[PDB]
DNA sequence: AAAAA
DNA sequence: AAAAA
């Protein structure tokens, strides 16, 4: 494949929730809200948004919180740019219940096309892919739902990638697949049409001029059915990256459960666990795990995390460390539903970086839809170094604790920490 | 296949080392030495012995211990029955070094055919199958090497199965394969001749009148190359038995390491571990692990055992308990090489029983040769109940300790227990 | 934000 | 008894 001769730059945007403060003053990136506002201001031809749910108002949460202001602003911008001529298209998973949808109808009346994709009746899951494609030259990919709490109340990790028409259209292709697949009546085709096929997969990634220095990047999609022949499955890419590492593997994910949740009877899913154990045993790879715990985390997950932190010895030089990153909450933020959590889902090695939109559980890789970006840069510094610095800042943060920490000591309510 | 109309009875023989005493007086079986002596006395037509090594003298150990007397007696019997007309045939793995072999030459001069099978040059391993076939009607299968220490100094678990011409010849077939395969020059055939093929495998086991009540039994062999089309691999049978269980799984094995030992670079082998985790998570199966620790155990093994004992929670009702069975030793028994250990390798469920000759490591299932017996009896009581009683006696014995036990507290030297 | 028999 | 670079 011909290299993409475009000034593809890339910014690691993150939304630090109020209260959280890293006392380093050395790493600084635009927040998710700032990047989204800039993309909307620069949007003049197209805007494709794949989202899980839309809660850009204090109305939909039934809360009176000023912190939603930024989110409301985004909604206002989304209302203003539709009449200007931008072909706004939004794919949002069909809600389980018939709850009112103020934002979606507000954009529909303005002129924004909305299609209700229903993953439950197609592959038995939800559509949890959160990404943007702006003018088909820039794009966004991260853990930020189209919510005000996502912008302010929870922590995110995403990439805004500018001037990359080639990686922007390869990402759209997924949005086009969602658009065609979830309009009405139509089901998953046996064979995907060539329009959705891609050429930049794991064996032949795409060459970009990522800040001048050449780099190899490509996107991975899920669930396996909604995947064309060219596209590399998200699980396969994740396993390849965790296997190719030879020095260290740093993982910061919201939820890591090696089981097929959201289904019964309970099923065991040892896919990422086996890869982590292989990498940490056969090779001297040091594995560092950073999970996030809140009030809506499965208490069984600890029982698996303890199964990994206990595998470390001298003879094979095994080294696995597991830490929980819990976002502190107060009385004011307690009343907000799904208020405080670290939703970042990514990992970084000494030779590659993976940034995804789905938690590390069997559903997100076999049923729930998701998208991830893989970047490998030959050289010292760059995107990989920036993400490694982000992960170490997270790792040494006061909010990151060991698996033996007392739950009451942590500010927020954690179900994975035994009391006293 | 037609059922084997033979009074196939079955005795669980075990060799309790001196010093060990279970204060129950309710379970009693003939020792391995007694059963071997009875088989030799009743031997008049044939005697096939597959063994790892031959140390039936105080000479070969270079020790002066009266406890070898029984072993010497066995050797004497093995010398006496050869001139009587018994076709004694012994398959013993070729030693790494050119050490003297008094017992093998003593039997060779009497008239016992000995063939030096060399597993290292054939499949890259050793021949660790310990079994007897006496007159092709009885047989023995257990963890007892042809050693005096095996008979007295270490603990064993084996089956002597009388009046079973059908299960005796199915076991011989393996000895015939070893005999032909390890004579001289000849290598492993691509396709095994029909003479070594068997009909009683996992899908179609053999029906026997095991103490009157019908039962389904069959044998499994390793390594996968020295296996005909009919024969079921040992690993496949082990996985099937650990998967079919629905209530509990009790495992008492000498060494359980989910790695490919005896080879470099270090390799990860998550085959039995994954099955145990699946059984204990998907179903409410209670898994109890009884490992044995001595002075020649890999210290890394604890790092994996802690990975299993830490997987137990309420939401999925997971329950895995790991215990170490350490045979106490004194100053007198310390000087004996490979003196005190619990060498039993078996497991029992609520519906099946597995008795093997090899430890639970990757080599023993992929390179090292081994044989195991599988029995499933429909009813309450019988062989399965006897083995379950044996396992619970072992589990509650004072010699069985938890993984957090202090090493100095245990009588013997254990490398898997952290000091103080 | 995929917690919700 | 498969501990032995
Ligand atoms: C590849 O090329 C792209 C294109 O330039 C680079 O993207 C730039 O990345 C740098 C650093 O990652 C960004 O610089 C940082 O911007 C942050 C956001 O600035 C906006 O928001 C603040 C909010 O108050 C406004 O005041 C400001 O005017 C902007 O609107 C700043 O917060 C950062 O400052 C932090 O670091 C400095 C030290 O440098 C400290 O003194 C500060 O206190 C603070 O801690 C910083 O300035 C830049 O904005 C990005 N550009 C764009 C267009 O997004 C990629 O980084 C590059 N890739 C690599 C690997 O280098
Ligand atoms: C299917 O059928 C076969 C054929 O009979 C059964 O095999 C018999 O199994 C029973 C019990 O498992 C055996 O009985 C036990 O024998 C032990 C060994 O006895 C020999 O060694 C002692 C050593 O001193 C000699 O004294 C003795 O004369 C024998 O030469 C005994 O040690 C056992 O005694 C224990 O239990 C009793 C209570 O019953 C206590 O009072 C004792 O103190 C001691 O704790 C016991 O007698 C029998 O020997 C086996 N027969 C053969 C030929 O091997 C299978 O058991 C059967 N299967 C099932 C499931 O029932
Ligand atoms: C993506 O590509 C566009 C197109 O090149 C970038 O916009 C360009 O940004 C540069 C500097 O950021 C601008 O250069 C400046 O121009 C002004 C006059 O407009 C001049 O006074 C300055 O000294 C400087 O030279 C350039 O004009 C501008 N071009 C356009 C068409 O907007 C954009 O910055 C790229 N994205 C990122 C994240 O860098
Ligand atoms: C395997 O099969 C052989 C053959 O049947 C069994 O040997 C038989 O054992 C029974 C009792 O154990 C003997 O019965 C006894 O016979 C004597 C006379 O010899 C009699 O006085 C007793 O009252 C009793 O009836 C039988 O004779 C004997 N037969 C032979 C040919 O040895 C053997 O016991 C079986 N194996 C096991 C473990 O049971
Ligand atoms: C919710 O949306 C409505 C209309 O878009 C706005 O407030 C509602 O309408 C009037 C005020 O305009 C009030 O009498 C209603 O009680 C309001 N509804 C609610 C649920 O408060 C406003 O845009 C939104 N309300 C907010 C953000 O509080
Ligand atoms: C063997 O492992 C031990 C601990 O598992 C190592 O000892 C130290 O352990 C602490 C806490 O785990 C570490 O912070 C140190 O870095 C370890 N090393 C030293 C020198 O203090 C020990 O180093 C390992 N290796 C050997 C040869 O004993
Ligand atoms: C070892 O075998 C030899 C011959 O089979 C026996 O003892 C050896 O020979 C004479 C006594 O017959 C002694 O002078 C030697 O010193 C003995 N050898 C050793 C190593 O002691 C006897 O059968 C065996 N020796 C034992 C069991 O101590
Ligand atoms: C939940 O788990 C706890 C412990 O993991 C159970 O509490 C007791 O724990 C001890 C020691 O582990 C056991 O010996 C008891 O059998 C457990 N039960 C009781 C009633 O004491 C607890 O039972 C589990 N279930 C619930 C509903 O809490």
User: Quick one: which of B32, B250, B218 has its CA closest to B143?
Assistant: B32
The residues facing A133 across adjacent strands are: A48, A139
Decide: B41 and B80 in contact? Cβ < 8 Å. Answer: no
Contact B7, B163 (CB under 8 A): yes
CA dist., res. A397 & res. B23, Å (int): 56
Residue B150 belongs to a domain with what CATH number? 3.30.870.10
Method for structure elucidation: cryo-EM
Taking the C-alpha atoms of residue B353 and residue B343, their distance in angstroms, rounded to an integer, is: 17
Domain assignment present for residue B414? The answer is no
How many Å lie between the centroid of ligand 4 and the Cα of residue B139?
18
Exposure on the CB side of residue A41, measured as CA atoms within 13 A: 7
The sign one gets for the Cα dihedral B365, B339, B132, B141 is negative
CB B18 within 8 A of CB B152: yes
B312 and A303 within 8 Å at the Cβ level: the answer is yes
**Nucleotide in closest CA–C1' contact with B263:** D5
Domain that holds residue A360: 9-186+204-409
Which residues make beta-bridge pairs with B9? B162
**What gap in Å lies between CA B350 and CA B353, rounded to an integer?**
8
Q: Is residue A382 part of a domain?
A: yes
Query: Are B377 and B384 a contacting pair, CB within 8 Å?
Result: yes
Strand pairing class (B213-222; B232-233): parallel
Which residues are bridge partners to B54 per DSSP?
A: B146
CA-to-CA distance for B254 and B258, rounded, in angstroms?
Answer: 13
Rounded-to-integer distance, Cα A232 and Cα A133, Å: 20
Q: Which one, of A37, A262, A16, lies nearest residue A134 by Cα? A: A37
Nucleotide in closest CA–C1' contact with B153: D1
Q: Which residue has the tokens 């691509």?
A: B190
What residues contact residue A170 under an 8 Å CB cut-off, 6+ apart? A198, A200, A206, A218, A219
A329 domain residue, yes or no: yes
Exposure string over A356-394, b if 16+ CB within 10 A, otherwise e: bbbbbbbbbbbbbbbbbbbbbbeeeebbbebbbebbeeb
Compute, in angstroms, the gap from residue A172 CA to the centroid of ligand 3.
25
- Per DSSP, A28 falls in state -
Contact predicate B169/B160, CB 8 Å: no
Task: Label residues B20-44 b or e (16+ Cβ within 10 Å = b).
Answer: eebeeeeeebebbbbbbbbbbeebe
Q: E-assigned strands of A293-357?
A: 319-325, 346-349, 353-356
Strands B213-222 and B370-377: antiparallel
Classify residue B395 by burial, with Cβ atoms within 10 Å: 0-12, 13-18, 19+: middle
Cα separation, B293 vs B290, whole angstroms: 10
CA dihedral sign of residues A270, A278, A392, A213: negative
Q: How far is CA A305 from CA A288, A417, B64, B272, in A?
A: 12, 11, 52, 20
In a domain, B198, yes or no: no
Q: Which residues of B fall within a CB distance of 8 Å from A274?
A: 268, 270, 274
State the Cα–Cα distance between residues B307 and B321, nearest whole angstrom.
11
Residue B163 in contact with ligand 4 by CB distance below 6 A: yes
Cα of first residue to Cα of last residue in chain A, in angstroms, is: 58
Q: Which residue has the tokens 């604890």?
A: B302
| B282:A268 CB<8 A | yes
Which among B231, B210, B277 has a CA at the least distance from the CA of B372?
B231
Alpha-carbon gap, residue B237 to B282, rounded angstroms: 20
Phi-psi region of A202 (alpha: psi -120 to 50; beta: other; left: phi over 0): alpha
Contact by Cβ (8 Å): B175, B139: no
Which chain A residues contact residue B315 at CB under 8 A?
298-300
B416, part of any domain: no
Chains A, B: CB pairs < 8 Å = 72
CB A50 within 8 A of CB A226: no
Residue A194 forms part of a structural domain: no
Contact B376, B214 (CB under 8 A): no
Question: What are the backbone angles phi and psi of residue B15, rounded to the nearest 5°?
Answer: -110, 100
Q: What is the DSSP string of B118-152?
A: -STTTTSS-B---EEEETTTEEEEES--EEHIIII
**How many domains would you assign to chain B?**
1
Residue B197 resides in a domain: no
In 3D space, the residue among B288, B284, B291, B292 whose CA is nearest the CA of residue B250 turns out to be B288
C-alpha distances in angstroms, B240 versus A265, B203, B275, B276? 20, 10, 9, 11
- In degrees to the nearest 10, what's the CA dihedral of A125, A131, A136, A137? -150
Least Cα distance to A77 among A53, A99, A100, A44 occurs for A44
Count the neighbouring beta carbons within 10 Å of the beta carbon of residue B404.
9
* 3-state secondary structure string across B199-255: CCCCCCCEEEEECCEEEEEEEEEECHHHCCCCCEEHHHHHHHHHHHCCCEEEEEECC
DSSP state of A278: H
* Beta strand B256-257 pairing with B286-292: unpaired
d(CA B328, CA B294): 9
Q: ∠ CA A85-A87-A89 to the nearest 5 degrees?
A: 150
Please count the other Cβ atoms lying within 10 Å of the Cβ belonging to residue A407.
17
Q: Going along A341-417, which residue ranges are E strands?
A: 346-349, 353-356, 360-361, 370-377, 400-402
Chain D bases having any atom below 7 Å from a protein CB? 1-5
| Alpha helices, H only, B8-127 | 32-42, 69-81, 102-110
Residue A274, judged by CB atoms within 10 A of its CB (0-12, 13-18, 19+), counts as middle
d(CA B164, CA B234): 21
Residues of chain B with Cβ-Cβ distance to A265 below 8 Å are 282
φ, ψ of residue A340 in degrees (nearest 5): -120, 120
Q: Please give the Cα distance from B179 to B369 (Å, whole number).
A: 13
Query: Is the distance from the beta carbon of residue A79 to the nearest atom of ligand 5 less than 6 Å?
Result: no
Contact B194, B96 (CB under 8 A): no
Smallest Cα–Cα separation from A261: which of A367, A160, A162? Answer: A367
Largest CA distance in chain A: 66
Does the residue A4 lie in any domain?
no
**Residue lying closest to nucleotide D3, CA to C1':** B296
CA distance linking residue B223 with residue A395, whole number of Å: 46
Q: Give the separation between CA B246 and CA B310, rounded to whole angstroms.
A: 21
Distance of CA B395 to the CA centre of its chain: 19
Sequence-distant (≥ 6) Cβ neighbours of residue A218 within 8 angstroms? A170, A200, A201, A202, A205, A206, A232, A237, A373, A374
Which positions 169-188 on chain B have a beta carbon less than 7 angstroms from any atom of strand D?
none
- The number of angstroms, rounded, from the C-alpha of A204 to the middle of its chain's C-alpha atoms is 23
Task: Give residue for tokens 């050429």.
Answer: A199
Which residues are CB-contacts of B146 (< 8 A; sequence separation ≥ 6)? Answer: B49, B51, B52, B53, B54, B55, B56, B92, B103, B130
Burial A164-174 (b: 16+ CB within 10 A, else e): bebbbebbbbb
DSSP A109-177: HHT-EEEEE-STTTTSS-B---EEEETTTEEEEES--EEHIIIIISB--EEEEES-HHHHHHHHHHHHH
State which residues between 39 and 78 of chain A bring their CB within 7 Å of strand C.
Answer: 52-53
For B85, other C-beta atoms within 10 Å of its C-beta total: 10
The token duo for A50 is: 């794949």
| End-to-end C-alpha distance for chain B, whole angstroms | 58
Contact A314, B321 (CB under 8 A): no
Ligand nearest to the CA of A386: 1
Q: List the residue whose alpha carbon is closest to atom 35 of ligand 1.
A: A28
Cβ within 8 Å of residue B9, ≥6 positions away: B161, B162, B163, B210, B211
The number of residues making up chain B comes to 420
């Amino acid at each position: 494949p011909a290299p993409c001769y475009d000034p593809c730059e890339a910014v690691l945007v993150e939304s630090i929730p109020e209260g959280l403060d890293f006392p380093n003053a050395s790493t600084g990136n635009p927040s998710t809200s700032q990047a989204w506002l800039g993309l909307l201001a620069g949007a003049h031809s197209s805007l494709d948004i794949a989202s899980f749910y839309w809660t850009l108002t204090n109305n939909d949460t039934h809360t009176q919180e000023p912190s939603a202001q930024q989110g409301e602003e985004v909604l206002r911008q989304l209302q203003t740019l539709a009449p200007k001529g931008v072909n706004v298209r939004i794919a949002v998973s069909k809600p389980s219940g018939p709850q009112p949808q103020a934002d979606l109808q507000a954009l529909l009346q303005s002129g924004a096309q909305v299609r209700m994709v229903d993953m439950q009746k197609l592959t038995h899951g939800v559509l949890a892919t959160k990404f943007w494609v702006v003018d088909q030259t820039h794009f966004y990919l991260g853990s930020a739902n189209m919510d005000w709490r996502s912008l302010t109340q929870v922590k995110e990790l995403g990439v805004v990638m500018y001037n990359c028409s080639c990686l922007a259209r390869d990402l759209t292709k997924i949005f086009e697949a969602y658009w065609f697949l979830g309009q009405a009546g139509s089901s998953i085709p046996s064979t995907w049409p060539r329009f959705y096929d891609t050429r930049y997969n794991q064996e032949t990634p795409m060459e970009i001029c990522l800040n001048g220095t050449p780099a190899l990047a490509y996107l991975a999609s899920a669930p396996p059915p909604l995947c064309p022949s060219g596209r590399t499955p998200d699980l396969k890419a994740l396993l390849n990256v965790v296997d190719n590492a030879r020095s260290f593997i740093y993982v910061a994910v919201m939820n890591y459960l090696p089981t097929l949740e959201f289904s019964h009877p309970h099923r065991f899913w040892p896919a990422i666990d086996d890869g982590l154990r292989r990498a940490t045993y056969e090779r001297g790879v040091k594995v560092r795990l950073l999970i996030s715990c809140w009030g809506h985390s499965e208490p069984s997950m600890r029982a698996f995390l303890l199964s990994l932190a206990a595998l470390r010895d001298n003879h094979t030089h095994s080294d696995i460390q597991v830490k929980l990153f819990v976002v502190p909450a107060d009385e004011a933020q307690a009343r907000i539903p799904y208020a405080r959590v670290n939703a970042n889902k990514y990992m970084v090695t000494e030779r590659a970086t993976y940034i995804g939109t789905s938690n590390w559980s069997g559903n997100y890789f076999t049923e729930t839809a998701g998208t991830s970006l893989l970047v490998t840069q030959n050289g010292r510094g760059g995107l990989r170094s920036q993400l490694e610095a982000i992960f170490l800042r997270d790792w040494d943060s006061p909010y990151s604790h060991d698996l033996d920490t007392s739950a009451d000591s942590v500010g927020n309510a954690c179900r994975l920490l035994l009391e006293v």
